Design a protein around this ligand. Structure first.
Ligand SMILES: [Fe+3]
Length: 822
C-alpha cells in the first residue's frame, strides 16, 4: 500500500544572478499530500492523504539536468483513496525553492502519473492557501473529474486576487492596471506623463497590476519602486547569469548610462562624430574611455558580454551584419528600398492605387495636405503613371498622417527637429523596388519634394532626405511595430489566460509557452526603457511624447488585421487568390518577410487546426466552455477594454473562431515579434543606416550649414542624426535585445516533453516540429537561389534568415522564439 515517488527541484541559488544546503530538505522540511481524483469526501471534494516528507536524495536518476536535485518519497495510499490526481505541498523551510516535477511509479506505465510543476514554492506561512499542483491530464471544464472540480475553481480564484493590495515578490496574483507608472512627478514636475489607458483620448492595452499606491503629488500616477512586481512564476531564473538579458536593460539605465555621461561631461572623448570613420571605429579599434568608466562597466553581469575590452581603455562593439561584406552598401537607394521588405521593419509599406496620395487629416488644422509630388517628376523606367498604377507597381511608405499631429510639439524640443515623410517606391521589371521621390512635410522652413540624384549637392540633399525617412521609420518600428504590436498588445492575453483558464485546460496548454518571459521583460521596460527620462526617451526622436504617440496609433489597432494574410491584403501588397497555396498572391513576388512568413503562418495554422478538434468536436463545445468564455470576455472587455466596443472582435462561438484567435496570438508572440526584433543590431548597429533621431531641418541656401553640406557631406549627415552619446546607449540596448539567450525555447520546442498525457496532442506537436525543419530547408534554398538575390541579399549581401525557425545562442540574425522573451 505504498506509492513510490520522485520529486525534482532546483535550490534557490542555482537560478539566481549565498549557499544552498541539500540535506536541509530532508527531515520534516517539505510535506506533500496526495489528493484523490476518484474518491470524494462528504462535500464532493477529493480525499486528501497524510503529510508525507522527503525521505532522501536520489543521485541514481540519469535524466537530471543542470542544477536539478531529485528526492525520494513514499506515500501510504490504501484502497479507500482511489487514484491520485493532484497534490498539496508545504515548504516549512525559510528559503524558497523551484519545484520542477513529481512522478508516481506504478506496476507498468500507465499508470505512471506525472506532475509538471515548474513553480517557486515559498514558506507555507506566506500563502493564504496551500499550493496545489495537478497531474498532466488535460480537461475542458465539463470533463474534470468531479472530486477535482472545486480544487480547479479555488485555484483560479487564488490567481485572480481581489483587485486590491500591494503585490509582493511571492504573490501569484494576475490583474490589470493602466500605464500610470511611467511618470515620476514626485521627483520633478517635468517628469509627469499622461496616464495611458482608460480613456478615449489615450486608449492603451492594460498591463500587469502592481499596486504600489499613488504618488504624493498626483493621485492618479503610481509611485516608483525598486522592483516592479510580476507574478512570481513569470520572473524567470536562469542557470547562467549571462542569460538574464532582461536585467541588462536595468543595469544600462542605472549604472552604464551615467558612466558614459560622465565621460562626455569631462570632455574625455569628443562630443560629436566628425566623419563616418569615427562611427566605423566603434567596432574596429573601439572607443577609448577613462579607466574608471571601463572599471565601472565590465564587472557587471550581462553588460560585460556586450563589448570587447582591453580592461583599461577600450570598448569595442561587435561588427554589425549590415557592414560585414560592404562598408558602404547601406548608402545605396537599392538597400534603402530593400530594407522596407527585408529589414528590421518590413511590415509598413503599402500599395498605391491612386495618385497623388491623400491625407486623412483635418484640412482646418493642417491646411491642404494633398501630396505635392507630381507624376511628371518621376522616373518610372519608361512607364507612365497610368501603366504603373494599373499594373500595381507603385508603393508607398507613408508617415505623413502618423507624424504630422506631433511635428510641432517635437520640433519645439531642444535638440530635435523632424519632418513628416512620404516615400514613393517603384517595383521595377527585375522585381526590385526603386525609390523615386521623398516628400518632407511640416505643419502650417517649408514642405518639399526631393528626387533622387547621384551627383552634386542634390545628391547630399537626397541622402539627408532618406535619413529623415528612416528616423520616421525607426521611431515607428520601435514604438509601434515592436513595442505596441507585440509586447504591449500581448500582455493582456497573458493576464486573462492565468485568471480564467485552468492549468488543466487544453487552451492554457496550447498558449502559455508563447508567453514565456513576456510580463517580466515588459515590467523591466516600464521601469527603465519607456519611463520618464528612460532609455527610449533619451535615444529616440519624440522624447517625452514617445509612448503617447503609440496610444494614438493604438486607436487604429485591429486584432484580426494582425493575421499575416489579412495584413498583406489590408496594406495592398497582396490580393486574395484561391489559386495559390496560401490564399493570397504577393504583388511583390520575392517580398522576403511575407513569403517566408506565409510558410511559418501555415505551419502554425496546421498545428492549431489539428490540436483544437482533439478537445472540441462542435461549435457547441466552444460556446459551452465556461472558462474559455470568461477568458475571452475579460481579455476584450478589460485587457483591451478601451477597444471593447469595436465590431471586429471575434465572438468565439465556433470552432473556426477559436482556431483564428489562437493562431493570431501565437503568430504575434513568435514569428511577428522575431521578425521585428532580432534584426535590430544587425541592421541598426550602424547608426547611419538606422538613425533614431534627427536634430535639424534641411539647411537653407546661403547659410554656413549649406556650405558645409557642399564641402563635407559626412559631417552634414552626422550633424543631422543621433549624436554620439545617445548612439552609444542605443547601440548597447539593441545589442541586448537582438541576442538569443542560451535557455531560449524556440518554435516547435517545449520545456518539458510531458506537458500533457494526451498522446494524440504529443504526436500532432511532433508533426509541427518536423514541418518547421522542412520549412527551414526551404528558406535556405531561397537564400541560395540566384533569381532572388536582389531582394533576399541585396547590395549588403546579407541573406534574410530572420524567419529561420532554429538558432544557436547569441546575436545570430535567425531563430523564432516561442514568445516575446526579450
Ligand atoms: Fe522585443
Amino acid at each position: 500500500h505504498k506509492i513510490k515517488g520522485t520529486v525534482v527541484l532546483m535550490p534557490k541559488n542555482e537560478l539566481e544572478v549565498a549557499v544552498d544546503n541539500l540535506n536541509a530538505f530532508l527531515g520534516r522540511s517539505v510535506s506533500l499530500q496526495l489528493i484523490s481524483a476518484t474518491k470524494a469526501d462528504a462535500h464532493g471534494k477529493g480525499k486528501v492523504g497524510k503529510d508525507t516528507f522527503l525521505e532522501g536524495i536520489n543521485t541514481s536518476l540519469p535524466t537530471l539536468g543542470a542544477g536539478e536535485s531529485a528526492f525520494n518519497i513514499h506515500f501510504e495510499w490504501d484502497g479507500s483513496m482511489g487514484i491520485p490526481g493532484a497534490f498539496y505541498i508545504k515548504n516549512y523551510m525559510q528559503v524558497e525553492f523551484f519545484l520542477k516535477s513529481l512522478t508516481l511509479e506504478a506496476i507498468s506505465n500507465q499508470g505512471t502519473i506525472r506532475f509538471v510543476c515548474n513553480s517557486w514554492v515559498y514558506n507555507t506561512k506566506l500563502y493564504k492557501s496551500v499550493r496545489i499542483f495537478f497531474a498532466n491530464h488535460t480537461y475542458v471544464p465539463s470533463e474534470t473529474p468531479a472530486p477535482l472540480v472545486e480544487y480547479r475553481e479555488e485555484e483560479l480564484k487564488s490567481l485572480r486576487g481581489n483587485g486590491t493590495g500591494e503585490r509582493k515578490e511571492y504573490d501569484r496574483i494576475y490583474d490589470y492596471d493602466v500605464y500610470n507608472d511611467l511618470g515620476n512627478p514626485d521627483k520633478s514636475e517635468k517628469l509627469a506623463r499622461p496616464v495611458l489607458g482608460g480613456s478615449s483620448t489615450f486608449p492603451y492595452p492594460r498591463r500587469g497590476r502592481t499596486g504600489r499606491g499613488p504618488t504624493v503629488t498626483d493621485p492618479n500616477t503610481e509611485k516608483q519602486g525598486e522592483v516592479f512586481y510580476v507574478p512570481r512564476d513569470e520572473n524567470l531564473g536562469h542557470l547562467k547569469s549571462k542569460d538574464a538579458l532582461e536585467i541588462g536593460t536595468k543595469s544600462l539605465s542605472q549604472i552604464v548610462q551615467p558612466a558614459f555621461e560622465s565621460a562626455f561631461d569631462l570632455k574625455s572623448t569628443p562630443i560629436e562624430f566628425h566623419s563616418f570613420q569615427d562611427v566605423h571605429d566603434l567596432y574596429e579599434g573601439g572607443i577609448k574611455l577613462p579607466r574608471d568608466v571601463i572599471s565601472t562597466i565590465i564587472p557587471l553581469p550581462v553588460i560585460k558580454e556586450l563589448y570587447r575590452t582591453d580592461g583599461q581603455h577600450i570598448l569595442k562593439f561587435p561588427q554589425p551584419h549590415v557592414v560585414q561584406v560592404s562598408q558602404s552598401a547601406w548608402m545605396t537607394d537599392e538597400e534603402f528600398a530593400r530594407e522596407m521588405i527585408a529589414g528590421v521593419n518590413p511590415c509598413v509599406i503599402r500599395g498605391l492605387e491612386e495618385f497623388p496620395p491623400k491625407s486623412n487629416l483635418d484640412p482646418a488644422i493642417y491646411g491642404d495636405q494633398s501630396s505635392k509630388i507630381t507624376a511628371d517628376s518621376l522616373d518610372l523606367d519608361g512607364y507612365t503613371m497610368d501603366e504603373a498604377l494599373g499594373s500595381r507597381r507603385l508603393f508607398m511608405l507613408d508617415y505623413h498622417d502618423i507624424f504630422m499631429p506631433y511635428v510641432r510639439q517635437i520640433n519645439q524640443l531642444n535638440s530635435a527637429k523632424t519632418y513628416a515623410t512620404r516615400t514613393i517606391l517603384f517595383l521595377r521589371e527585375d522585381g526590385t523596388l526603386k525609390p523615386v521621390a521623398i516628400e518632407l512635410s511640416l505643419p502650417h522652413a517649408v514642405s518639399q519634394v526631393v528626387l533622387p540624384a547621384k551627383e552634386g549637392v542634390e545628391s547630399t540633399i537626397w541622402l539627408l532626405a532618406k535619413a529623415y525617412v528612416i528616423v520616421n521609420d525607426s521611431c515607428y518600428h520601435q514604438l509601434m511595430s515592436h513595442w505596441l504590436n507585440t509586447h504591449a498588445a500581448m500582455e493582456p492575453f497573458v493576464i486573462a489566460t492565468h485568471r480564467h483558464l485552468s492549468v488543466l485546460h487544453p487552451i492554457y496548454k496550447l498558449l502559455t509557452p508563447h508567453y514565456r518571459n513576456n510580463m517580466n521583460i515588459n515590467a523591466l521596460a516600464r521601469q527603465s526603457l519607456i519611463n520618464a527620462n528612460g532609455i527610449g526617451e533619451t535615444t529616440f526622436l519624440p522624447s517625452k511624447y514617445s509612448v503617447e504617440m503609440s496610444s494614438a496609433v493604438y486607436k487604429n489597432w485591429v486584432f484580426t488585421d494582425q493575421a499575416l494574410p489579412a495584413d498583406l491584403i489590408k496594406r495592398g501588397v497582396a490580393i486574395k487568390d484561391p489559386s495559390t497555396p496560401h490564399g493570397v498572391r504577393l504583388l511583390i513576388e520575392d517580398y522576403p518577410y511575407a513569403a517566408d512568413g506565409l510558410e511559418i503562418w501555415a505551419a502554425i495554422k496546421t498545428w492549431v487546426q489539428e490540436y483544437v478538434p482533439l478537445y472540441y468536436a462542435r461549435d457547441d463545445d466552444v460556446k459551452n466552455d465556461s472558462e474559455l468564455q470568461h477568458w475571452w470576455k475579460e481579455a476584450v472587455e478589460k485587457g483591451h477594454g478601451d477597444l471593447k466596443d469595436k465590431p471586429w472582435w471575434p465572438k468565439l462561438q465556433t470552432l473556426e473562431d477559436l482556431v483564428e484567435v489562437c493562431l493570431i496570438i501565437i503568430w504575434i508572440a513568435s514569428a511577428l515579434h522575431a521578425a521585428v526584433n532580432f534584426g535590430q543590431y544587425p541592421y541598426g548597429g550602424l547608426i547611419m543606416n538606422r538613425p533614431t533621431a534627427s536634430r535639424r531641418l534641411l539647411p537653407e541656401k546661403g547659410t554656413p550649414e549649406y556650405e558645409e553640406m557642399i564641402n563635407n557631406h559626412e559631417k552634414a549627415y552626422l550633424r543631422t542624426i543621433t549624436s554620439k552619446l545617445p548612439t552609444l546607449i542605443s547601440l548597447s540596448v539593441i545589442e541586448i535585445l537582438s541576442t538569443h539567450a542560451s535557455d531560449e525555447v524556440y518554435l516547435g520546442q517545449r520545456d518539458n516533453p510531458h506537458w500533457t498525457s494526451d498522446s494524440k496532442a504529443l504526436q500532432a506537436f511532433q508533426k509541427f516540429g518536423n514541418k518547421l525543419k522542412e520549412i527551414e530547408e526551404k528558406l535556405v534554398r531561397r537564400n541560395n537561389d540566384p533569381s532572388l538575390q536582389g531582394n533576399r541579399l541585396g547590395p549588403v549581401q546579407l541573406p534574410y534568415t530572420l524567419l529561420y525557425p532554429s538558432s544557436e545562442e547569441g546575436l545570430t540574425f535567425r531563430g523564432i522564439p516561442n514568445s516575446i522573451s526579450i
